[PDB]
Ligand SMILES: *[C@@H]1O[C@H](CO)[C@@H](O[C@@H]2O[C@H](CO)[C@@H](O)[C@H](O)[C@H]2NC(C)=O)[C@H](O)[C@H]1NC(C)=O
Ligand SMILES: *[C@H]1O[C@H](CO)[C@@H](O)[C@H](O)[C@H]1NC(C)=O
């Protein structure tokens with residue numbers, strides 16, 4: 293005699309709350325994270341030329357402190373400096389060290 | 395380590411797929427923008443209205 | 448959302464509809480049935496994917512910048528060096544927060560719109576052969592077997608074919 | 623706004639309706655009357671309040687920054703110190719201006735939507751018992767005393783109860 | 798757009814209508830004809846022009862700032878001087894990109910809305926004298942010469958005058 297068509301939309305057993313203009317938290321069906329908050333902890337040696345300073349700081353590799361002579365003529369895309377790198381040659385100082393390093 | 399990653403941060407490399415990152419403000423290469431937030435969900439679907447009602 | 452269809456005149460949603468985002472459910476003389484609409488489903492998916500592209504994977508590339516951590520107290524320059532970066536991060540954090548807010552308000556109103564569009568597409572196909580219940584359902588005033596229901600679903604429903612039947616029932620006499 | 627109800631098909635507004643934002647006005651055999659709709663009124667109020675929260679009272683906390691006023695001409699650094707701050711203030715002023723613009727466009731379109739939603743909620747309740755005048759009014763084609771008018775206002779109006787009466791008048795004969 | 802009228806239920810557009818943005822086309826007993834609607838056309842034009850003003854011709858005025866190009870390598874300060882400017886340009890480039898995106902989404906949804914508004918204005922004028930085909934056309938169930946068609950176009954169409962005629966045809970008998 294008569295029939296019944298009903299329009300509708302899907303839903304899911306577990307939505308995710310999202311912020312909007314009016315709602316701080318409202319439930320959508322699905323959503324993605326736009327903020328990256330994790331690292332592997334290691335530095336990939338590619339595609340950038342990562343030259344590790346090890347016990348030396350760029351400045352000492354520059355001046356040629358003996359333990360650093362191993363860097364003579366090195367190049368890099370990113371020179372990495374370690375926290376406990378040390379200088380073991382004539383005591384010195386670099387007025388405006390930050391600029392020479394930069 | 396031996397792997398591939400354009401974005402390097404002092405905390406180690408991080409994937410540059412998402413637009414922003416909360417790992418470190420110091421970055422090198424193709425990296426996401428550093429922001430104070432830790433999570434930012436972009437809705438990718440309609441509202442979810444279960445048969446709760 | 449702005450359209451009052453999803454979380455409005457359409458009570459709740461179907462966790463059962465897993466082959467689409469929008470669709471139909473029906474009951475005729477012989478039974479019940481259900482089926483997802485691909486068109487509206489793709490419109491929604493397509494818009495959200497477009498939106499998703501603009502945001503995702505669009506990183507700048509920066510190399511040597513300024514320093515941002517310091518070993519000793521220095522004064523005027525490091526203050527400035529810190530202020531520049533701090534200022535930068537807050538404006539970028541404002542940028543992110545606002546984008547997700549506007550984007551999400553927009554995705555919700557949009558998908559609301561696509562439900563309602565389907566509804567008006569169907570309402571218009573059904574001409575004088577059906578009346579709206581107001582819960583997202585049309586009460587078809589004539590016999591409509593599953594093939595009939597499908598013709599509607601795929602927009603080939605010819606309302607002239609069922610007019611007289613429909614009209615009659617919609618306007619029956621107490622006799 | 624986008625919905626064409628407020629400052630559109632609904633001529634003007636009621637300074638007289640002080641117990642709500644949206645509501646009804648009617649005229650039947652015995653008289654006239656008026657009453658505010660709470661639901662739509664709260665939807666509007668609620669959304670605007672949500673929006674109001676995100677903006678209001680969310681201040682950062684900053685302590686020692688850079689200097690911004692100077693006693694003597696200095697050159698390179700003070701130029702930079704001034705440029706950093708000036709640059710910061712303009713980007714923040716852009717931020718404020720745009721937010722109010724987008725927010726306001728949004729509040730207007732939103733409240734437009736809630737009027738229209740009410741209208742479609744009512745239109746759907748009235749089934750074949752009423753026809754739309756187009757100025758926001760439905761012409762109910764059957765006797766509807768204040769209790770009848772209220773049943774509509776609180777969504778319990780049963781249109782089957784008044785169908786035959788309504789239909790008859792909507793489709794009277796020149797006889 | 799959000800409204801499903803333009804690039805939705807209204808198939809395509811008229812390159813032929815050059816005196817307006819929105820309008821009508823008709824076919825009656827004596828012929829065919831066409832004419833642009835000024836109102837909707839001005840609403841669209843007006844909103845877009847308002848939007849256009851806010852953006853256009855609103856430049857700041859800046860005079861002595863910092864230097865931005867350098868002859869020699871210097872270090873710490875020039876790094877900072879470059880970082881400040883670079884940072885400024887990216888935040889401004891984000892600003893421009895986003896504005897055009899939001900503005901354009903908005904202009905499209907807006908003009909969609911104005912088409913649909915016209916449609917609902919006309920739908921409401923036609924009362925029970927016409928039925929919707931669903932491609933943007935109303936099938937007027939009564940004789941409507943060009944003067945009749947114009948009365949609709951300029952909103953003076955009185956549907957009581959043609960009711961009985963219309964009703965009759967909309968609900969003819971197989972006899
Ligand atoms: C990334 O590394 C930094 C240090 O390089 C971590 O930040 C410090 O961590 C603790 C806890 O979050 C705080 O008390 C320090 O003050 C933080 N320092 C800074 C500058 O923020 C950071 O949490 C690391 N994050 C990840 C995900 O590895
Ligand atoms: C009619 O609708 C679509 C149009 O492409 C078609 O693919 C569909 O399968 C048709 N329905 C059936 C049952 O064939």
Ligand SMILES: *[C@H]1O[C@H](CO)[C@@H](O)[C@H](O)[C@H]1NC(C)=O
Nearest residue numbers: 769772773774775776777778
């Ligand atoms: C029917 O509508 C609401 C539902 O909560 C109720 O509170 C209201 O007072 C009712 N109307 C009357 C006159 O009781």
Ligand SMILES: *[C@H]1O[C@H](CO)[C@@H](O)[C@H](O)[C@H]1NC(C)=O
Nearest residue numbers: 944947948949950951952953
């Ligand atoms: C009726 O509509 C407008 C109202 O201003 C008027 O200017 C128009 O010319 C009228 N139509 C005709 C043919 O006069």
